[PDB]
């Protein structure tokens, strides 16, 4: 990733700073809304001791990593499919005519649509030219889950409280996502300016290891 290499710079660059140690902490002027993600993932179910990673995006569109390390992902037409082999090779077709080696993932895919249109919240369904990104990869800790997108964008969601980041390099941006579910986009650069509270500075510090991790 030429983009991760850019965002653990950025990340390391707001938290050396030390954004919540100031005189006057002004997060506010920060935020900047001509930044706000396309996509994030609104839903995931996580089979992985047999299938894989279901997830869905807020276009509504729906994928799986599955554990073979191949991916499928649905558009939001009900119709569309793109499938993405190990190496990264992309094939395109749709439910009504597809090879039959298909045939076993393209149901798991249905399965895990069945359950996602049905069951789980819809994160960040409060808020509005990309291509439709794909899960590159995602892990688990004991205290959050993370998503690493093929756009360059890695999203975390924080188990205990229910806060999540999603951070765009493309942007230097990130958005955090509160207890309250309230939803504010921000310019790194400008954080690392004018400060910020003691709960993202905690959750962008997390972040700069996860993005580790994700490096490796």
Same mark, same amino acid.
């Given at each position: *990733?030429?983009? =991760? /290499? *850019?965002? =653990?710079?950025? =990340?390391? !660059?707001?938290?050396? /700073?030390?954004? /919540? @140690? &100031?005189? #006057?902490? &002004?997060? %506010? @002027?920060? %935020?900047?809304?001509?930044?706000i993600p396309i996509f994030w993932v609104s839903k995931w179910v996580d089979y992985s001791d047999k299938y894989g990673l279901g997830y869905q995006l807020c276009d509504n569109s729906v994928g799986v990593l599955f554990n073979d390390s191949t991916r499928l992902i649905l558009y939001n037409d009900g119709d569309s499919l793109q499938y993405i082999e190990r190496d990264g090779t992309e094939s395109y077709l749709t439910v009504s005519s597809h090879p039959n080696s298909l045939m076993k993932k393209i149901t798991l895919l249905k399965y895990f649509r069945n359950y996602m249109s049905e069951h789980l919240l819809k994160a960040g369904a409060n808020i509005t030219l990309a291509r439709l990104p794909y899960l590159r990869t995602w892990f688990r800790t004991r205290s959050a889950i993370i =998503?690493? #997108? !093929?756009?360059?964008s890695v999203q975390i969601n924080f188990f205990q409280d229910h806060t999540k980041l999603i951070l765009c390099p493309l942007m230097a941006a990130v958005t955090y996502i509160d207890e309250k579910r309230d939803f504010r986009t921000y310019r790194l650069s400008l954080l690392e300016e004018y400060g910020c509270c003691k709960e993202l500075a905690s959750r962008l510090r997390y972040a700069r290891t996860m993005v580790d991790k994700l490096l490796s």
């Open positions: *990733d030429c983009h =991760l /290499s *850019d965002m =653990l710079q950025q =990340l390391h !660059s707001v938290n050396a /700073s030390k954004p /919540s @140690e &100031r005189g #006057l902490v &002004r997060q %506010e @002027e920060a %935020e900047d809304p001509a930044c =998503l690493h #997108l !093929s756009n360059g």
